[PDB]
Symmetry: C3
Subunit: 274 residues, 3 copies
Amino acid sequence: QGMKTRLEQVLERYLNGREVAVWGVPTRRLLRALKPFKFHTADRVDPQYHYVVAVTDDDLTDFLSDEQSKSFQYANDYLTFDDEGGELPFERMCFNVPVGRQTYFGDGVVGACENGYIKSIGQFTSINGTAEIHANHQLNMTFVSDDIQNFFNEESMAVFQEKLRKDPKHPYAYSKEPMTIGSDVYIGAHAFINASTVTSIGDGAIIGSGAVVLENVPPFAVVVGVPARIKRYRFSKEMIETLLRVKWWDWSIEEINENVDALISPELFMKKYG
Amino acid sequence: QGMKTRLEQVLERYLNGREVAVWGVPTRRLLRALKPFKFHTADRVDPQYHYVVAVTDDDLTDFLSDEQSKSFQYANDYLTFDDEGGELPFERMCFNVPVGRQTYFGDGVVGACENGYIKSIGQFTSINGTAEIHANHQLNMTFVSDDIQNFFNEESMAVFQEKLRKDPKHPYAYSKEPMTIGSDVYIGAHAFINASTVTSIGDGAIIGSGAVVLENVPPFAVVVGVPARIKRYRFSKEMIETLLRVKWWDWSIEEINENVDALISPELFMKKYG
Amino acid sequence: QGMKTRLEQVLERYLNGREVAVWGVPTRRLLRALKPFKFHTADRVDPQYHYVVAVTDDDLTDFLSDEQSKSFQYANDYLTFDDEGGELPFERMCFNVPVGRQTYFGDGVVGACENGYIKSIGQFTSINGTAEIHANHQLNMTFVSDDIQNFFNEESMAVFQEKLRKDPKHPYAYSKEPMTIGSDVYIGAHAFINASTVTSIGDGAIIGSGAVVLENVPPFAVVVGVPARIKRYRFSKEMIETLLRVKWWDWSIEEINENVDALISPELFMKKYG
Ligand SMILES: CC(C)(COP(=O)(O)OP(=O)(O)OC[C@H]1O[C@@H](n2cnc3c(N)ncnc32)[C@H](O)[C@@H]1OP(=O)(O)O)[C@@H](O)C(=O)NCCC(=O)NCCS
Ligand SMILES: CC(C)(COP(=O)(O)OP(=O)(O)OC[C@H]1O[C@@H](n2cnc3c(N)ncnc32)[C@H](O)[C@@H]1OP(=O)(O)O)[C@@H](O)C(=O)NCCC(=O)NCCS
Ligand SMILES: CC(C)(COP(=O)(O)OP(=O)(O)OC[C@H]1O[C@@H](n2cnc3c(N)ncnc32)[C@H](O)[C@@H]1OP(=O)(O)O)[C@@H](O)C(=O)NCCC(=O)NCCS
Ligand SMILES: NC[C@@H]1O[C@H](O[C@H]2[C@@H](O)[C@H](O[C@@H]3[C@@H](O)[C@H](N)C[C@H](N)[C@H]3O[C@H]3O[C@H](CO)[C@@H](O)[C@H](O)[C@H]3N)O[C@@H]2CO)[C@H](N)[C@@H](O)[C@@H]1O
Ligand SMILES: NC[C@@H]1O[C@H](O[C@H]2[C@@H](O)[C@H](O[C@@H]3[C@@H](O)[C@H](N)C[C@H](N)[C@H]3O[C@H]3O[C@H](CO)[C@@H](O)[C@H](O)[C@H]3N)O[C@@H]2CO)[C@H](N)[C@@H](O)[C@@H]1O
Ligand SMILES: NC[C@@H]1O[C@H](O[C@H]2[C@@H](O)[C@H](O[C@@H]3[C@@H](O)[C@H](N)C[C@H](N)[C@H]3O[C@H]3O[C@H](CO)[C@@H](O)[C@H](O)[C@H]3N)O[C@@H]2CO)[C@H](N)[C@@H](O)[C@@H]1O
């Protein structure tokens, strides 16, 4: 591929001449990524000479259960291969989609990034692995199937995709801006977001479990239900207005540790920034 | 097994004397299927001499990212092993369940086919991988568990299964016709269908995301919610009556490309067939 | 690890000096478990000399499709490695969580046991694999993210976790008793239980599909919906009172086979124990 995966971005910044020790049975995709480096099956590992790469999450659990792993820092010294959505201490990219710091999501949102459904994902955003993000099929035609186009010749493909781009309900997310997910967002298990109608999820939004959101979620609102309805705002109006332009999620690691009291007490946060 | 898998049906029609090149680390099930053929780890692949079989979907993505793959047509020259529900250009079978053309579904619906819960799946049907199809346990007894029968002797098993067949609410889908899923059907993510009470899903039906359907879905109806309620019909009544017996989903690949305008414009479809 | 996995508990009781035959490609975790025993790739298997261990569930299906498997009893002679939640004929443990007999659950509930969210799981309980059990993040602060704490030093971690323990809404299930799931419970697909607010699920409870439960479920109640509401009780009040202290789920395998008629007919059950 032309766009670097999460494993390749981590290695580019933290490997630093060491050889990669593979903790687990590798995939063909992994062997292609490790081709330029020296790599081997992990036996005796030393973080001064080695960088452990666990193939799967279950292989990571086995590695952390090993006594050899407690001299290995999270991303500086190891990583999970099959974890494109895993959180990171630095801003990264996922199929031309910027992902903030300490932001994690599941395989469904990863596939949504590759489909072009997402424009950006904020910092300190927590998304459950079971969450799904898909677009709508076309509804202005006699059929709803998408793989019917596998039978169209050119002449038929040109006219089918012609109406697709000229559709105000955005089938396959064709005619809309890619959806943005803000910072400090929480998304629960079994949640769903429609990539055809949702174009923005505000910062600090909370999506309940089993919730099916079909429209935009304003910042710091808690949407819940099937379909998702706003049941309560997370903060007061004055806080949401202030929080939107102070942007604590863009602070440095030292500045977050300086204003712990402001981030911990919401009543103190307004006092310092209202 | 006695019933051919999707990989075996594809190979039986398109392999044509070539040897299989395995793109990825194979499973024991795959090695059993490839036993009669000549097979090897894929290196340099040529579609005139080789047929690429990617073990998993992630191995398929790695194969398509390789320059060698662009002389390989979808099913005629490659396929994914762990993809029993993947779409195909020809009608196939899945555990004694006929599956139409360009119809795809996930692992939960595959397991539903093997359980005998499904009778047939139409053509050009799109089912999300997260969709689940299960039956109800028995409710006319003091227990709801199913694996309690692991402790029954013969005498106890005969009487337990005796009432199971004599139950009008169809526990474990015992006393009903297997459920039929029509053509041009769309099923969203996190959807659920009760195999104990649902016996038919009409052609052209649309099941929303997170929807739990518990009764039959009439053709070209859009069921939505927990539980699923009909919120709107996809087409006018006159169209549904006409569409049910013209059956465009049974047209040839040449006839679909002949009547693209009818399938693309619903207003034109009635003009040509009303 | 210090706590035995489900595979290690089964082997400790049923292996009995035999060598393990691995049906499938093993993981690194599996190789660590089989280290003290003699093990090999399964070829010709005899239950008098061998104990088959299928790595994955798909490898189990391949094994049962083999003619060699029909002299192998379920747990006494084989088992699936990647199946920590699979049912068993004897009471077992899962990350310091007692699991009853013939009780099965999915990977999400397994991870919930390791997180400390569950105290015990009853006997003859049926939980769907797609079910999820998670706790709530903190809501009394300006942020909702959990992995923000990866940036806190000591001083910041001590004060963040300080309010976490002093929170009546139980973020991360910090200040509550671990949730108990009773016996003869049925949980459907796509179900969700909030580990932060739910502390008990009574015996004989039934959770419908796609249901999001947020409070305790009384014994023998059927909760349904988003959010889950009690729609109907499974039995009469007099039965629930009697069933709660006869505890048929604690009977021996011989006593279950003695009182099949009582367990099969609910009307007969009260006659014998009311
Ligand atoms: C969304 C959530 C944070 C709400 O937390 P909360 O502040 O304690 O909400 P409350 O318990 O006070 O109840 C608020 C109302 O909204 C409803 N509600 C809240 N969360 C709901 C949910 N997931 N689903 C359905 N209804 C919900 C409640 O039924 C309640 O109804 P009411 O208006 O009649 O009182 C929490 O319930 C939740 O579901 N978090 C997601 C859990 C998860 O999936 N984690 C995995 C991802 S890490
Ligand atoms: C079902 C679906 C096609 C409806 O499309 P639509 O024609 O644009 O429906 P609308 O947006 O006009 O809204 C219709 C009504 O039904 C509701 N509704 C529609 N889809 C819903 C859904 N999945 N869940 C809950 N409610 C839904 C809407 O809330 C709305 O309510 P209203 O009567 O008060 O106005 C679409 O919403 C959907 O969910 N598709 C499934 C997406 C998916 O899961 N893809 C993965 C599988 S490939
Ligand atoms: C929960 C369940 C056992 C109810 O069975 P039941 O006794 O036949 O319930 P009924 O069909 O008589 O309907 C009862 C009412 O509750 C509703 N209801 C029942 N189950 C529901 C469900 N999963 N979701 C939403 N609504 C449900 C029905 O819509 C109905 O509504 P009403 O009050 O207007 O009549 C069953 O519907 C179910 O969903 N089982 C879980 C299936 C599953 O997920 N299996 C996989 C795990 S092994
Ligand atoms: N290109 C996105 C892909 O998404 C995959 O995950 C999901 C889907 O994108 C994937 O797509 C299915 C596919 O199974 C099947 N073989 C073909 C079918 N047309 C697709 O259907 C789906 O994907 C396409 C996007 O390409 C959408 O246009 C369509 O609306 C949607 N139903 O099925 C998976 C479960 O629904 C993988 N995560 C990933 O390998 C890949 O990035
Ligand atoms: N035979 C169907 C199987 O379905 C599997 O997928 C799902 C279930 O069928 C499977 O079945 C579970 C099983 O985990 C566990 N080891 C035993 C338990 N009795 C089963 O329970 C389930 O399956 C049976 C059907 O056999 C139903 O009667 C029962 O109502 C249902 N709860 O758990 C999986 C998640 O719920 C596999 N896709 C597939 O290997 C296999 O075909
Ligand atoms: N320690 C529990 C783990 O749960 C895992 O499954 C699920 C989660 O526990 C897991 O945790 C995610 C994780 O993906 C990501 N790398 C880090 C993130 N902080 C976690 O987030 C989640 O887990 C933690 C519990 O540790 C909760 O406090 C948090 O509320 C929750 N959002 O993401 C998975 C899907 O949501 C695995 N089943 C298992 O390896 C492991 O036991």
